[PDB]
Copies of this chain bind each other. A is one copy, B any other.
Amino acid sequence: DGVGSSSGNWHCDSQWLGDRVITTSTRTWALPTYNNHLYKQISNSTSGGSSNDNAYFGYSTPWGYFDFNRFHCHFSPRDWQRLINNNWGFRPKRLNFKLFNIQVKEVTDNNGVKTIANNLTSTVQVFTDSDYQLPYVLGSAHEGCLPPFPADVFMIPQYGYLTLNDGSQAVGRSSFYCLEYFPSQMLRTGNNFQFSYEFENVPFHSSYAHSQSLDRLMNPLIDQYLYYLSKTINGSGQNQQTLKFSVAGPSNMAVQGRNYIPGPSYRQQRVSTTVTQNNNSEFAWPGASSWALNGRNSLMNPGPAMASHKEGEDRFFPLSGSLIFGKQGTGRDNVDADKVMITNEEEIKTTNPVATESYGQVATNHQSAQAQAQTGWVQNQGILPGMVWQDRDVYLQGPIWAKIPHTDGNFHPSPLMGGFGMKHPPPQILIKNTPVPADPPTAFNKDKLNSFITQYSTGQVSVEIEWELQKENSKRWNPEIQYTSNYYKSNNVEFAVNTEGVYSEPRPIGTRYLTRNL
């Protein structure tokens, strides 16, 4: 429109209908100039990397991008509490995104002092990768998302991508992408940008915990009509071999026939938070479970959805089997256990195997009069018919969605870090300040200009997402477990600001508090 007219209003609210909840969040953003308007080839050689497992090749772009792939970007703690305490499931339906109130500033430095002024004629470029023609980086748990607290002003992260690499070198199959080779809208201070997105059909997330275990689905009062081999010898010596059979009933539930079995496994090492119970050696990387791709080892992290620990074993965790969040103010490198928040998936112990245990035991020979029957620990077990399992729970500060890789085949493409897997997720939204050259020389020079006016941009961003709800219809008589704040007095209110205005999330919040039968 014009310089003196706002191009949008501040929309931040949650609307709770019967089967739907609409979340709207608005944030103020700041966008600097990245790479001084240049594309730069990057690799482990440029960053000084040495290990083969961490070698990479890619490019850093002068473009930024908007990321809102975390639940706290849309749900307040109270809204999250309502969702998790009142619904058996939820899923995103549609998306509305807006950029408005664009403000481009120029910075001039004379001598140790910088002056900031408006540049009303400068432009900012925005476009969406609706055709998914660029590498998708929103599927990784990267920082730079919209802040959970609406009053926080955030910096737009720089967009970068990786391609095929051989050490620090590239190959002929490696791809280079120029983001200026895409049509993009150019916005001055009076212009705004908006688009709508429809989520593809995804299953409802399981925001419930099973009230039954897979091995306890039988009637505890009635025998089965099936038999089991109870004895093989002749009880109370030589030549004592005689078959025996008994009815599988309530007294021996472990041997009853069952139609379904727990889901797959890939065993993790077990770590205690009581440090003196751990071995006196360096076992992080060495002791960890991993997978290999083209000679590179990548940590199995977080891996298959598996129960974090056995009942009562709360002190133990799988070495890389769980999402680890950092508390407010936590450092980047080598922080103590009290500075991080270790999530756990104990709710899925009713259907999923324990991460630090074998799947089970399997026969490994043919027993005879000369050879005793032998069994072997199944340390990893693939998908088998009749298996059932629960996916990893999602969290308030955890990811929402991920892009399913474009491959010939996949199985249960639920993101392993939690969330909704989609072939066509919300498109990447890329933003960049248009370069403004400084005064050029009065004589023609064919070289590209390298002198630009120092600029940055700021504005507001709004994203509205409609969520579909799956209401609970339980006939359970006793009250359910519910997420609740603790009344006991404390220096600060949980999920609030401190005396210095710092917002903090004191604990990870899952979604599985209500219960339903298996």
Contact between chains at B233 and A159 (CB < 8 Å):
no
Contact between chains at B243 and A41 (CB < 8 Å):
no
A270 interfacial contact with B, CB 8 Å:
yes
A261–chain B nearest beta-carbon distance, Å = 6
A429 interfacial contact with B, CB 8 Å:
no
Given contacts A28-B437, A221-B160, A380 and B362 within 8 Å (CB-CB): yes
What's the Cα separation between A159 and B190 when bound, in Å? 31
A347–chain B nearest beta-carbon distance, Å = 8
What's the Cα separation between A331 and B120 when bound, in Å? 40
A258–chain B nearest beta-carbon distance, Å = 7
- A137-181 contacts to B, CB under 8 A, are 137, 139-145, 147, 149-167, 169-178, 180-181
A256 interfacial contact with B, CB 8 Å:
yes
B residues within 8 A CB of A166? 311-312, 489
B residues within 8 A CB of A250? 47, 56
What's the Cα separation between A389 and B411 when bound, in Å? 9
What's the Cα separation between A22 and B320 when bound, in Å? 51
Contact between chains at B334 and A367 (CB < 8 Å):
no
Contact of A292 among B239, B332, B353 (CB under 8 A): B353
Contact between chains at A444 and B144 (CB < 8 Å):
yes
B residues within 8 A CB of A320? 228-229, 255
A179–chain B nearest beta-carbon distance, Å = 8
Contact between chains at A294 and B517 (CB < 8 Å):
no
A293 interfacial contact with B, CB 8 Å:
yes
Contact of A30 among B115, B228, B440 (CB under 8 A): B440
Contact between chains at B389 and A140 (CB < 8 Å):
no
B residues within 8 A CB of A187? 6
Given contacts A220-B161, A257-B141, A414-B409, A363 and B291 within 8 Å (CB-CB): no
Interface centre among A188, A219, A299, A372, by most B CB within 10 Å?
Answer: A219
Contact between chains at B110 and A113 (CB < 8 Å):
yes
Bitwise, A180-220 to B at CB < 8 A (1) or not (0) is 11111111111100000000000100100111111111111
Contact between chains at A301 and B475 (CB < 8 Å):
no
Contact between chains at A360 and B300 (CB < 8 Å):
yes
A357 interfacial contact with B, CB 8 Å:
yes
A426 interfacial contact with B, CB 8 Å:
no
Contact between chains at A264 and B384 (CB < 8 Å):
yes
Contact between chains at A270 and B366 (CB < 8 Å):
yes
B residues within 8 A CB of A443? 158
Contact of A267 among B156, B206, B363 (CB under 8 A): B363
* Closest chain B residue, CB of each to CB of A518: B405
Contact between chains at A310 and B283 (CB < 8 Å):
no
A344 interfacial contact with B, CB 8 Å:
no
What's the Cα separation between A266 and B366 when bound, in Å? 14
A483 interfacial contact with B, CB 8 Å:
no
Contact between chains at B270 and A161 (CB < 8 Å):
no
Contact between chains at A375 and B4 (CB < 8 Å):
no
Contact between chains at B172 and A487 (CB < 8 Å):
yes
A337 interfacial contact with B, CB 8 Å:
yes
A417–chain B nearest beta-carbon distance, Å = 5
Given contacts A39-B151, A166-B311, A487-B171, A382 and B264 within 8 Å (CB-CB): yes
B residues within 8 A CB of A476? 175-177
A247 interfacial contact with B, CB 8 Å:
yes
Contact between chains at B517 and A181 (CB < 8 Å):
no
Contact of A226 among B241, B325, B368, B486 (CB under 8 A): B325
Contact between chains at B332 and A223 (CB < 8 Å):
yes
A49–chain B nearest beta-carbon distance, Å = 7
Interface centre among A5, A125, A367, by most B CB within 10 Å?
Answer: A367
Contact of A155 among B151, B413, B449 (CB under 8 A): B449
B residues within 8 A CB of A471? none
A424 interfacial contact with B, CB 8 Å:
no
Given contacts A170-B492, A257-B301, A386-B412, A189 and B4 within 8 Å (CB-CB): yes
Contact of A448 among B153, B165, B287 (CB under 8 A): B153
What's the Cα separation between A443 and B64 when bound, in Å? 11
Contact of A289 among B375, B438, B498 (CB under 8 A): B375
B residues within 8 A CB of A183? 9-13, 24
B residues within 8 A CB of A497? 38-41, 59, 176
22 CB contacts below 8 A, A to B, read A10-B125, A10-B186, A41-B492, A56-B220, A105-B439, A134-B517, A135-B217, A151-B178, A158-B443, A172-B481, A174-B493, A186-B460, A215-B298, A217-B405, A228-B324, A254-B298, A264-B382, A271-B367, A286-B375, A292-B353, A388-B409, A436-B458
Question: Which 9 interchain pairs have the tightest Cβ spacing?
Answer: A382-B382, A287-B373, A38-B501, A4-B190, A291-B360, A172-B487, A150-B180, A259-B415, A385-B412
